[PDB]
């Protein structure tokens, strides 16, 4: 029941303002628990620690004296200390330079931690853990762009920086923000979702195993360099949002955030509740006011400090189901949703035009609704049923039988107050034990035929074209904004796959072939000049920011799509041989209709079968439901997208 969850949020608001003042005071925790340099030169420290018989800082800096330096117990499990400044006015704690904080348990145990704030941790070599670094750099980054204007529409490019090379390395944000951003924007993209931000011991863990919640990755280079790149981006008009895990935690407890104070709870729930079996990770314990502080202290982190433009939450659905859309009727969590709701409202009275993205595979209805009507306060939900449908069909039937009502009932059927993100493949299937798009449509000829100095077999053909039509179907009709993952876009080969035990530390699959588009004797430039040209189609008449399309056809038997959006007309043939000559489709207004888009165009690896001067003319003649209509010819495998100039 939703007037129950909205009373129960408006308690834990009315709360936050009695006793912390606000969600903006709330949020800024990160101001004082960690380890600061004070402008006197003095350092304060503060942790959350209910279950520690002592706290203690230590680190270079003392010379790993455990217990020379130990917190003060505060009310409510809390710890501080102030070390004075130095007579000499030099400082406590050089940048660069090794820090631990110190638990005594119950036990009489001796634990080391890092920080559950942690600004930066680093690996060392061959070393089994992260080091705490302490980050005091001379020149902060000052930031020279302001945010970009709240797009009309959202074309979201999917990336990781740390694959974003041709080399078998992590590559770095530095070469991100030089050598990638050009590309995203040459694309027509608007916005980036930044994979893999928060710190994750575990590289193969696709950025999914966070140790150090505050901690922007190491790996990749310095916090000031993501900075640039975020403000890099802006200067470029694209906005970016963070991949926010806030589902689960690592079991790390040497330099994770799992047994900080020696004990099971703190953080996160104790028992086999508090404990993920399958992901093998810590759960939060999202009734509690601490977590609640750190959570959304992270949350407005993010927003303040890297100048992030809003999130995607991952595992929404697992922060809603653990416990347990044949969702109905299941008990929700309502801890989980309750801190959701609280991360929305403090993301959007911010700043309204932030933008976030809820991962849920459920469907649970209202997630993406207002949180005065009980729902969760996301402004989109990833469509996920769409790259299922595109797998099915691709795995399971022949051509000639596709469903045409099954292809537009799986991209229509959404929620009218929905939002949602549209994509034909995820990050999921670029994956070593999965198959991507391009490989699904073209298999082994992948690697013989997409040369240009070969023969452009019926395999290669087909690929090329259907890779065109699954993505402008989904584009065009999906949703009400678009998503696609780094190098799908160009119909990237083999696979991708971080080092790990199952490949000895392989760094082979853990890249991006980038070059492959700007090499002429290739056909990915074919896949890559139509998302380009696909994206750049949308910026000019914005089919993503209206309303749902008119579906006029929907013909099993020639295989035929037709339909209209934003004024535009769509028509896809799908027909595997067929093609058609003097075939009559509806349009709402009459007039004169000119080719806007064709796949079958020679720059997109087409037949370039069509002459664009040709006029389409459609005149008061009634046909599936639609005042007037034109006749177009449409080749088999061919979408257009056509324009009344009227
Ligand atoms: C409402 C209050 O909740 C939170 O405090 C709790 C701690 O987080 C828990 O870990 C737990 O720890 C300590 C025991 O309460 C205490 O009896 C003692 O045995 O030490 C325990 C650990 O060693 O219990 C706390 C109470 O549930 C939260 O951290 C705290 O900030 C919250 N306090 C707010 C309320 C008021 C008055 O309305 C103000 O005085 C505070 O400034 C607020 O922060």
Not at 97 to 111: A, P, Q
Not at 246 to 256: I, L, R, T, Y
Not at 412 to 441: M, P
Not at 472 to 500: K, S, V
């Amino acid at each position: 029941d939703f007037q129950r969850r909205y009373k129960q949020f408006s308690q834990i608001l009315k709360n936050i303002g009695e006793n912390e003042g606000g969600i903006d005071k709330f949020s800024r925790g990160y101001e004082s628990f960690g380890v600061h340099r004070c402008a006197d030169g003095g350092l304060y420290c503060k942790e959350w620690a209910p279950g520690a018989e002592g706290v203690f800082l230590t680190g270079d800096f003392n010379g790993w004296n455990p217990f020379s330096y130990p917190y003060k117990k505060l009310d409510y499990g809390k710890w501080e200390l102030y070390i004075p400044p130095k007579q000499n006015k030099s400082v406590l704690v050089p940048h660069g330079s090794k820090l631990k904080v110190v638990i005594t348990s119950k036990s009489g145990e001796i634990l080391y931690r890092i920080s559950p704030w942690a600004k930066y941790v680093v690996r060392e070599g061959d070393n089994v853990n992260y080091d705490w670094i302490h980050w005091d750099p001379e020149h902060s980054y000052e930031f020279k762009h302001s945010r970009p204007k709240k797009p009309r529409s959202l074309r979201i490019y999917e990336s990781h920086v740390g694959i974003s090379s041709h080399e078998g390395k992590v590559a770095s944000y530095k070469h991100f923000t030089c050598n990638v951003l050009p590309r995203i924007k040459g694309l027509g993209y608007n916005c980036i979702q930044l994979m893999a931000i928060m710190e994750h011991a575990y590289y193969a863990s696709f950025g999914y195993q966070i140790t150090s919640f505050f901690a922007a990755s190491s790996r990749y280079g310095s916090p000031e360099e993501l900075q640039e790149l975020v403000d890099t981006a802006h200067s470029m008009g694209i906005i970016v949002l963070l991949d926010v895990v806030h589902s689960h935690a690592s079991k790390n407890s040497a330099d994770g955030l799992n047994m900080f104070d020696g004990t099971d709870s703190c953080y996160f729930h104790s028992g086999p509740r508090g404990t993920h079996d399958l992901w093998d990770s810590r759960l939060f314990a999202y009734s509690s006011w601490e977590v609640l502080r750190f959570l959304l202290s992270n949350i407005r982190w993010w927003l303040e400090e890297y100048r992030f433009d809003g999130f995607r939450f991952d595992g929404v659905t697992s922060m809603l189901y653990h416990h347990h859309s044949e969702y109905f009727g299941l008990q929700v969590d309502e801890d989980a949703l309750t801190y959701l709701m609280l991360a929305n409202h403090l993301v959007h009275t911010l700043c309204p035009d932030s933008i976030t993205i809820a991962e849920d595979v459920s469907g649970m209805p209202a997630l993406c609704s207002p949180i005065s009507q009980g729902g969760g306060g996301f402004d989109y939900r990833l469509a996920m049923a769409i790259p299922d449908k595109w797998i099915q069909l691709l795995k399971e039937f022949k051509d000639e039988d596709w469903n045409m009502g099954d292809i537009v009932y799986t991209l229509t059927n959404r929620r009218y107050l929905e939002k949602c993100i549209a994509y034909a493949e995820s990050h999921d299937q670029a994956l070593v034990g999965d198959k991507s798009l391009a490989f699904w449509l073209m298999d082994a000829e992948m690697y013989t035929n997409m040369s240009v100095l070969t023969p452009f077999t019926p395999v290669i053909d087909r690929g090329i074209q259907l890779h065109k039509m699954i993505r402008l179907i989904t584009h065009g009709l999906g949703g009400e904004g678009y998503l696609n993952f780094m190098g799908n876009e160009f119909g990237h080969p083999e696979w991708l796959d971080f080092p790990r035990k199952g490949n000895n530390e392989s760094y082979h699959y853990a890249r991006r072939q980038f070059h492959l588009t700007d090499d002429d004797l290739l056909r990915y430039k074919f896949l890559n000049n139509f998302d380009r040209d696909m994206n750049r189609l949308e910026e000019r008449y914005g089919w993503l920011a209206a309303p749902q399309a008119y579906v006029s056809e929907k013909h099993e038997g020639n295989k035929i799509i037709a339909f209209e959006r934003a004024g535009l007309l769509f028509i896809f043939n799908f027909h595997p041989s067929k093609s058609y000559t003097d075939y009559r489709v509806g349009t709402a207004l009459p007039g004169k209709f000119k080719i806007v888009l064709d796949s079958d165009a020679a720059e997109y690896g087409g037949h370039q079968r069509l002459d664009h001067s040709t006029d389409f003319f459609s005149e008061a003649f009634e046909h599936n439901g639609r005042p007037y209509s034109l006749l177009v010819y449409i080749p088999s495998r061919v979408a257009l997208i056509l324009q009344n100039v009227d």
